Amino acid sequence: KETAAAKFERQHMDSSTSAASSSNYCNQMMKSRNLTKDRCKPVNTFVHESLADVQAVCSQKNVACKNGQTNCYQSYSTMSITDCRETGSSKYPNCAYKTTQANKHIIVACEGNPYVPVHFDASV
């Protein structure tokens, strides 16, 4: 059904803004990207850069993934990102999130032919 690449774009890509729109960004986006459907996803990161710039990270600095696989890549540039972190007050089905914008290096896992991002590992 949903490709791994498509799932990455739905969960992690938001090129349509340059930063976190507002303090309510994570509440709206976690909902609209269907990450509060079956439970409140506790944490999530959105990347504000172009799809082409995020796809280009698959050719950048190869680093170990947190799960010990070898197919993770760190961006040479900093990127505009928004971190979403579920609050203590959050109870499913009204998932509640603190929005934090940052400019950080991203780490993504890449797979497939073509070789594309499928997982957001970390920011640094």
Domain ranges of the chain: 1-124
CA-nearest of 38, 25, 37 to 85 is 25
How many of the other CB atoms lie within 10 Å of CB of 96?
15
> What distances in angstroms separate CA 68 from CA 10, 63, 77, 114, one per listed residue?
25, 10, 24, 22
Resolution in A: 1.4
Measure the CA–CA gap between 106 and 11, rounded to whole angstroms.
15
Catalytic residue among 33, 48, 105, 119: 119
In the annotation, is 12 catalytic?
yes
Catalytic residue among 8, 9, 12, 110: 12
Binding residues for substrate: 7, 10, 41-45, 66, 85
Dig out the tokens for 124 from the structure: 């640094």
